[PDB]
């Protein structure tokens, strides 16, 4: 629609404005439950041609059943928690002796309703398959019959839609091991995680939001494993609460600024180290340095607040006028003069220093610009591809307004060499009491002389 | 944080119309935005609802595709268009301005101070 | 003609505790979903009294205590106070009505 960046060349960055913003903050968790019967064997004469097939099924039914049985840059500032937290609850919950057992009996034939447990929660329950009356209608009257014959294979392929789905769960969580991330429609199909979404408690809009996006939320669903006991073999679903959704935010990406120095290995230079995504929750921040974590799909981002900074509204000042006493301004330093590029939304931000062949082409007119010295900046409808050291890059081709305002060298505002290149985190502040004080070393070294 | 809005008065029904929100919230993009009329006799109802981009729109079932939402983040303010009129239309209308909670909710927190809309004769 | 149900016939002696309950359907509120109440003194604009049932705004006494059960919630006033002459409200987010508001209940002192 309307996606837009500008290009600050005082410090070389892209801020990707205008986004809507549908974070999650919460957990939402429902019982799935599928039924089955505890077959005993087949008590069969003979082995017969038409039925051979419903014997290795059922066998490697048991097996399976028998399995799952035996089944039971700023990232360094950034928290770590357990993900996997309501749900292991939730089936802990459901370990106690004389609970599941309500789950079996509430939910007998309306295909979902609600429960309470012993704590009081009452999110929802659900029945996935229906293995009870396929079993003791449809499969057993004709398998346990004298020297068992079935009326007709073509009966079995149904059978084989009600089985395949068990099938899946078995190689998902013998590998797996209790969670799998993303969750496969095997556990909960397109319809039906559909039908769900119209089930929590949540906005109509939220509703729209997941109805238009299911596969990205069955991206980040978690899916954890409950007890097996009384053949109501079942996991809980962690489905995603989104707790604030449609706000602009944007993706900083940075990029060097360094001098081409004629003596090499002599050009100090400070980057911005701001690398990620940043959106209001609230009257604060949320920032995500991990860009992984965060996913876009068609001007929709969705990504984990559980590893997020609650940082102030005071992070667009320091964007703009990264000179203000009012942020911290963590900026990197360093004597490294590295050809380095990035791919924002729409354009490109070159920075190549020194020997480096710096050309920008299209698969139109050949090549079209080429980048000397400096940082530089070249909208994505003005190029297609760009070579940059011994590297090509393909730009994205999403239709949008992009600008690029002119900036400054700010590496030439401070001193030609008193920077340090030891530490991996500082501050405009930290760097400005380093100055201050190398100064006054100094000047205290050439008063005593 | 406070809001104004203006666009009441008399107007015979039938006719399009044109309501503002001029919300002085200086960070007018992240908090959710109704609009509601509280009516004498009956109680107050909700009307309208948007959020940042504008992209999920939702109205009251009483005015389906009746009122017309827009937003401009920029200029920090809100337009709602009466495509269609009626008698009950008459009432006091709140531009609020509501906070998100930890599910998804509108607390519909600090409102506006209210424009009579008078729709009689 | 709302689903938030609420007898608007509530009044007492200031002094005395005075207990608000409005209900609702199972989509509303039942479905998982919390309540809000606010004021209605005429003038001045109407503002958040309690939401999500048991969290307080800013400047409020704590003369209000909200509770939720079910489908129903309910509002508790201990020690009524001469200026709560006012009409308080109900909001959930029914699957039909998106936001829902309630009648409001008329309370005045004695």
């Known amino acids: 629609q309307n996606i837009t960046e500008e290009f600050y060349q005082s410090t070389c960055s892209a801020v990707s404005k205008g986004y809507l913003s549908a974070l999650r903050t919460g957990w939402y968790t429902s019982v799935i439950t599928i039924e089955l019967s505890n077959i005993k064997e087949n008590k069969c004469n003979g082995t017969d041609a038409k039925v051979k097939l419903i014997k290795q099924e059922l066998d490697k039914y048991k097996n399976a059943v028998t399995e799952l049985q035996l089944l039971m840059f700023l990232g360094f500032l950034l928290g770590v928690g357990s993900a996997i937290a309501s749900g292991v609850a939730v089936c802990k919950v459901l370990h106690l002796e004389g609970e599941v057992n309500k789950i079996k009996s509430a939910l007998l034939s309306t295909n979902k309703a609600v429960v309470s447990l012993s704590n009081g929660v009452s999110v929802l329950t659900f029945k996935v398959l229906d293995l009870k009356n396929y079993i003791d209608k449809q499969l057993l009257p004709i398998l346990n019959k004298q020297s068992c014959s079935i009326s007709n294979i073509e009966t079995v392929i149904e059978f084989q839609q009600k089985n395949n789905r068990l099938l899946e769960i078995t190689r998902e969580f013998s590998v797996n091991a209790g969670v799998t991330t993303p969750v496969s429609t095997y556990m909960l199909t397109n319809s039906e995680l559909l039908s769900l979404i119209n089930d929590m408690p949540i906005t109509n809009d939220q509703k729209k939001l997941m109805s238009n996006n299911v596969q990205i939320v069955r991206q980040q669903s978690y899916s954890i494993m409950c007890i097996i006991k009384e053949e109501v073999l079942a996991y809980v679903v962690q489905l995603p609460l989104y707790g604030v959704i449609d706000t602009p935010c944007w993706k900083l990406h940075t990029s060097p600024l360094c001098t081409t120095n004629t003596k090499e290995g002599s050009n100090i230079c400070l980057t911005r180290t701001d690398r990620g995504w940043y959106c209001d929750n609230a009257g604060s921040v949320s920032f995500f340095p991990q860009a992984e974590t965060c996913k876009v799909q068609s001007n929709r981002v969705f990504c984990d607040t559980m590893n997020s900074l609650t940082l102030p509204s005071e992070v667009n000042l320091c964007n703009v006028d990264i000179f203000n006493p009012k942020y911290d301004c963590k900026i990197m330093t360093s004597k490294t003069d590295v050809s380095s590029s990035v791919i924002t939304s729409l354009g490109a931000i070159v920075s190549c220093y020194g020997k480096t062949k710096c050309t920008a082409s299209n698969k139109n007119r050949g090549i079209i610009k080429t980048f000397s010295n400096g940082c530089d900046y070249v909208s994505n409808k003005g190029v297609d591809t760009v070579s940059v050291g011994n590297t090509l890059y393909y730009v994205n081709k999403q239709e949008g307004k992009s600008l690029y305002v002119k900036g400054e060298p700010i590496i030439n505002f401070y001193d030609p060499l008193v920077f340090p290149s030891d530490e991996f985190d500082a501050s405009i502040s930290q760097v400005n009491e380093k100055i201050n004080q190398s100064l006054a070393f100094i000047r205290k070294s050439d008063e005593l002389l | 944080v406070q809001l104004v809005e203006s666009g009441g008065g008399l107007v015979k029904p039938g006719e399009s119309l044109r309501l503002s929100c001029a919300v002085s919230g200086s960070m007018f993009s992240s908090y959710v935005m109704h609009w509601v009329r509280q009516a004498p006799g009956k109680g107050l109802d909700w009307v309208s609802s948007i959020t940042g981009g504008g992209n999920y729109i939702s109205y009251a079932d009483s005015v389906k595709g009746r009122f017309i939402i827009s937003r401009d983040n920029g200029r920090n303010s809100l337009s709602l268009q009466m495509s269609s009129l009626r008698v009950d239309d008459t009432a006091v209308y709140y531009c609020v301005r509501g906070l998100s909670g930890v599910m998804g909710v509108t607390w519909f927190d600090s409102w506006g101070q209210g424009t009579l809309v008078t729709v009689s004769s | 003609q709302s689903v938030l149900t609420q007898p608007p016939s509530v009044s007492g002696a200031p002094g005395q505790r005075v207990t608000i309950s409005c209900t609702g359907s199972?989509?509303?509120?039942?479905?998982?979903?919390?309540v809000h109440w606010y004021q209605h003194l005429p003038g001045k604009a109407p503002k958040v009294i309690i939401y999500?049932?048991?969290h307080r705004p800013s400047g409020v006494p704590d003369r209000f205590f909200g509770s939720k059960s079910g489908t129903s919630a309910s509002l508790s006033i201990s020690g009524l106070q001469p200026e709560d002459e006012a009409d308080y409200y109900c909001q959930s987010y029914d699957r039909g009505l998106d936001w829902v508001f309630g009648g409001g209940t008329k309370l005045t002192v004695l």
């Open positions: 199972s989509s509303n509120i039942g479905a998982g979903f919390d």
């Open positions: 999500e049932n048991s």
